[PDB]
From a paper:
Rac1 recognizes Cdc42/Rac1-interactive binding (CRIB) motifs within its effectors through a hydrophobic surface that emerges upon switch I loop closure, ensuring that only the active, GTP-bound form can engage effectors with high affinity. The Rac1-binding region of POSH has been mapped to the disordered region between its second and third SH3 domains (residues 260–445). To delineate the interaction site of Rac1, we measured 15N R1ρ relaxation rates of POSH in the absence and presence of a 45% molar ratio of Rac1 and determined the chemical shift differences between the free and bound state of POSH using 15N chemical exchange saturation transfer (CEST) experiments.
To produce the effector-binding capable form of Rac1, we exchanged GDP for a non-hydrolysable GTP analog, GMPPNP. At the N-terminus of POSH, the partial CRIB motif (326ISPP329) within MRE1 occupies a narrow hydrophobic cavity on Rac1. Beyond the partial CRIB motif, MRE1 extends into a short, anti-parallel β-strand, augmenting the central β-sheet core of Rac1, followed by an α-helix that loops back onto the β-strand.
Author numbering:
A (entry chain A): 0 to 177
B (entry chain C): 323 to 344
Write the structure that this text describes.
């Protein structure tokens, strides 16, 4: 049977988990935000000339799905823990929620920490809106330190919108398994 | 040192993505 990888994507609502998956697998970007309960993407990649099936599992960022979400975790090979680079609350939830939940169910599964919406970090309006609430975007060093703190294999930054660093996220997930 | 190709979507439960297949 063709070699297969199950990758599960978790993180707060609105961080960009669904756009990450749509943009990576089809190069499209959806025009309207519809909250995810569960969704799936089956895609083939060539890894050193051999086909690999990527089973990508999308999950709900909302607290109301906390009891169902872990039921999708069995047989996971790698987790993507996602936070938005322009949402400090979503960053803090990596330590307060996502890392503890993933580790409770899957103590030995590799984690990639993913900073999303890279395109917004330099956006003056986004910066000013954060600044008005005494906040600042998450910097690369901050993300890196959080990755070290939670034992993540790798810290990566990307934009689903521009596709900057997007392919690298999934390539690194593959490398964490194969 | 790994050569990884872009993905080819085979299937999805997601309406937006499934529409862009094959
Ligand atoms: N500027 C920018 N906006 C993005 C990016 N990725 C997602 N967004 C926007 O952020 C919002 C939420 O994205 P989405 O992928 O639906 O988030 P989610 O993490 O899947 N949410 P949920 O857990 O509820 O399913 C949408 O308005 C989407 O267009 C990105 O790379 N850049
Ligand atoms: Mg979603």
């Amino acid at each position: 049977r063709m070699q297969a990888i199950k990758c599960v994507v978790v993180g707060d609502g609105a961080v960009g988990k669904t756009c990450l998956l749509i943009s990576y697998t089809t190069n499209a970007f959806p025009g309207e935000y519809i909250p995810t309960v569960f969704d799936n993407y089956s895609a083939n990649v060539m890894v050193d000339g051999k086909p690999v099936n990527l089973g990508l599992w999308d999950t709900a960022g909302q607290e109301d799905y906390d009891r169902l979400r872990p039921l999708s975790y069995p047989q996971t090979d790698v987790f993507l823990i996602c936070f938005s680079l322009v949402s400090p609350a979503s960053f803090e939830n990596v330590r307060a929620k996502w890392y503890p939940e993933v580790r409770h169910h899957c103590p030995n599964t590799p984690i990639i920490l993913v900073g999303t919406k890279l395109d917004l970090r330099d956006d003056k309006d986004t910066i000013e809106k954060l600044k008005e609430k005494k906040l600042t975007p998450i910097t690369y060093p901050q993300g890196l330190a959080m990755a070290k703190e939670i034992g993540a294999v790798k810290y990566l930054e990307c934009s689903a919108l521009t596709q900057r660093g997007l392919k690298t996220v999934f390539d690194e997930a593959i490398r964490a398994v194969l | 040192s790994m050569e990884i190709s872009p993905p080819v979507l085979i299937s999805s439960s997601n309406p937006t993505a499934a529409a862009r297949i094959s």
